[PDB]
């Protein structure tokens, strides 16, 4: 094993990152393993009072590729409610094959979609609040570094314009984002910190000065206004105990800057931000946002996975619906209706037609298509998020 308390890719692929009951159960089944073919579907037990931005499927395919199983799933970036128009639980993925062949991967499969999805969904909420103002994922520091890249990836797919993590940036194929830290002003002083920042930032990227280290934001803004000229943004990461009314403070700063003819200096805010916070601060004048904890710590959706068919016959347990299923969605209004797997489409009068969403990504362990890059996926989410305001 490795140094830190993590499971390597090798380990998760070997089925070591799972609840032991699986291998012990498969072991007990013995030769019956050769006669037990199943179909399992993942549904959200979790929060049912919100829509979801599905994410984490890419990880699932990396794990099941090579095994003799068929896999169906809703594409990443698809946004929808966990229950259909008639309150039926929506299946996001279906796996078919010999139970003993992939049963041990249930733990990891759920793990890949539960946490990631909560993150991308929360980022989409923030996306709606930020409107045409950009926001960036800044929270990987609140979670274990090992999952640093997946967090920034889902945050990006969910709507984030940029990301701060190096590996996350590499993974989404974008340049990392970053502004000067408080540490710089503490070590060299504001004036030198700002000078150094401006000198180490040339066109192709915007200038950003952190101003809350020592002074009152208002006077820091006036000082910067009459000291430099090539400053695109002023960033306020104002301490909680100093944040009596962040909105009024921002209006005050904006007025003082415009008074000296420097309304060209835009305002960026960060620190304990929410979809709620973002909306208010932007209505107050903030034009850029740094969002961390609320997104990186987003509660995971509670996905469950269970057998829905055995050797071709529909079969489940109490609290679950049997049979393999398809997920139909109206091409015009996005209404959804889950149906038995033998119903490919349904005619409607509303607008357009109802087509299957649960699509096959793996056939006998082989990919059925080239997987989309992160940019393409978030591009899809942004279109999808349109249907939700």
> Which residues are known binding-site members for Zn(2+)?
330, 333, 348, 350
339 binds Zn ion (CB under 5 A): no
Contact between 347 and 127 under an 8 Å Cβ cutoff? The reply is no
Residue 134 carries which DSSP code?
Answer: -
**Smallest gap from residue 261 Cβ to Zn ion (A):** 25
Q: Please, which residue, 2 or 332, has the CB nearer to a second copy?
A: 2
For the bound state, the minimum distance from the C-beta of residue 289 to Zn ion, rounded and expressed in Å, comes to: 31
**275-281 long-range CB contacts below 8 Å, 24 or more apart?**
275/122, 275/125, 275/126, 275/128, 275/129, 276/129, 278/126, 278/129, 278/130, 278/135, 279/129, 280/247, 281/246, 281/247, 281/250
List, as residue ranges, the binding site for nicotinate.
Answer: 21, 138, 179, 235
Q: State which residue, 196 or 332, has the beta carbon closest to a second copy.
A: 196
Q: Residue 196 or residue 333: which is nearer to a second copy going by CB? A: 196
| Residue 114 binding target from Zn ion, a second copy, none, CB below 5 to 8 Å by type | a second copy
- Residues followed by a gap in the chain, C→N > 2.5 Å: none
Task: Please report, in angstroms and rounded to a whole number, the separation of the first and last CA atoms in the chain.
Answer: 47
Piece in contact with Zn ion (CB under 5 A), picked from 106-114, 117-125, 284-292, 342-350: 342-350
Instruction: Sheet containing 288-291: give its strands across.
Output: 162-163, 135-137, 288-291, 266-270, 233-236, 208-210
Which of the choices a second copy, Zn ion, none does residue 348 contact, using the CB cut-off of 5 to 8 A by kind?
A: Zn ion
> Residue 334's closest CA among 316, 351, 317?
351
Question: Who's near 62: CB < 8 A, 6+ residues apart?
Answer: none
The region of 134-142, 208-216, 291-299, 347-355 touching Zn ion under the rule CB under 5 A is: 347-355
Residue with smaller CB distance to a second copy, 2 or 276? 2
**Other C-beta atoms within 10 Å of 166: how many?**
14
Using CB under 5 A as the binding rule, whether residue 327 contacts Zn ion is answered as no
Q: Give least dist CB 77 to a second copy, A.
A: 15
**Considering only residues 350-369, where is the footprint of Zn ion by CB under 5 A?**
350-352
Tokens standing for residue 21: 């009951």
Smallest gap from Cβ 347 to a second copy, in A, equals: 18
- Annotated binding residues for 5-phospho-alpha-D-ribose 1-diphosphate, written as ranges, equal 240, 272, 293
Q: Is 215 helix (H, G, I), strand (E, B) or coil?
A: coil
Nearer Cβ to Zn ion, position 145 or 351? 351
Minimum CB separation of residue 347 from Zn ion in Å reads 8
Is residue 330 part of the contact set for Zn ion (CB under 5 A)?
A: yes
**Nearer CB in complex with a second copy: 66/351:** 66
Residues in touch with Zn ion (CB under 5 A): 330, 333, 335, 348, 350-352
């Amino acid at each position: 094993m490795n140094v830190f308390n993590t499971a390597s890719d090798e380990d998760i692929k070997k089925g070591l990152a799972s609840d032991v009951y699986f291998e012990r159960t498969i072991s007990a089944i013995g030769d019956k393993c050769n006669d037990l073919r199943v179909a399992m579907e993942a549904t959200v037990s979790g929060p049912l009072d919100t829509w979801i931005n599905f994410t984490g499927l890419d990880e699932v395919l990396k794990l099941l590729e090579g095994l003799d199983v068929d896999l169906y799933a809703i594409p990443e970036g698809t946004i929808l409610f966990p229950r259909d128009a008639n309150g039926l639980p929506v299946p996001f993925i279906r796996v078919e094959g010999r139970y003993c062949d992939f049963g041990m991967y249930e733990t990891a499969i759920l793990g890949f979609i539960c946490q990631a999805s909560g993150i991308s969904t929360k980022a989409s909420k923030v996306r709606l609040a930020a409107g045409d103002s950009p926001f960036f994922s800044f929270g990987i520091r609140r979670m274990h570094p090992a999952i640093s890249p997946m967090i920034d990836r889902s945050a990006y797919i969910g709507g984030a314009d940029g990301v701060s993590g190096i590996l996350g940036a590499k993974l989404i194929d974008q340049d990392p984002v970053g502004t000067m830290p408080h540490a710089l002003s503490i070590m060299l002083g504001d004036e030198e910190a700002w000078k150094l920042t401006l000198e180490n930032t040339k066109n192709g990227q915007k200038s950003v000065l952190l101003i809350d280290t020592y002074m009152d934001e208002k006077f820091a803004a006036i000082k910067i206004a009459e000291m430099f000229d090539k400053v695109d943004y002023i960033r306020l990461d104002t301490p909680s105990s100093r944040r009596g009314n962040f909105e009024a403070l921002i209006r005050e700063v904006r007025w003082e800057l415009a008074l000296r003819g420097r309304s060209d200096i835009k305002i960026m805010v960060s620190g304990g931000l929410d979809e709620n916070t973002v909306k208010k601060l932007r209505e107050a004048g903030a034009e850029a946002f740094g969002v961390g904890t609320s997104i990186s710590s987003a509660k995971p959706f509670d996905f469950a996975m269970d057998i829905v068919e055995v050797n071709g016959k529909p079969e489940t347990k109490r609290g679950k619906m049997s049979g393999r299923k398809n997920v139909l969605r109206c091409t015009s209004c996005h209404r959804i209706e889950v149906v038995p797997a033998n119903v490919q489409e349904k005619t409607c009068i509303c607008g357009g037609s109802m087509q299957n969403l649960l699509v096959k990504y793996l056939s006998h362990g082989k990919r059925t298509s080239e997987y989309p890059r992160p940019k393409e996926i978030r591009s899809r989410s942004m279109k999808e998020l349109e249907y939700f305001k």
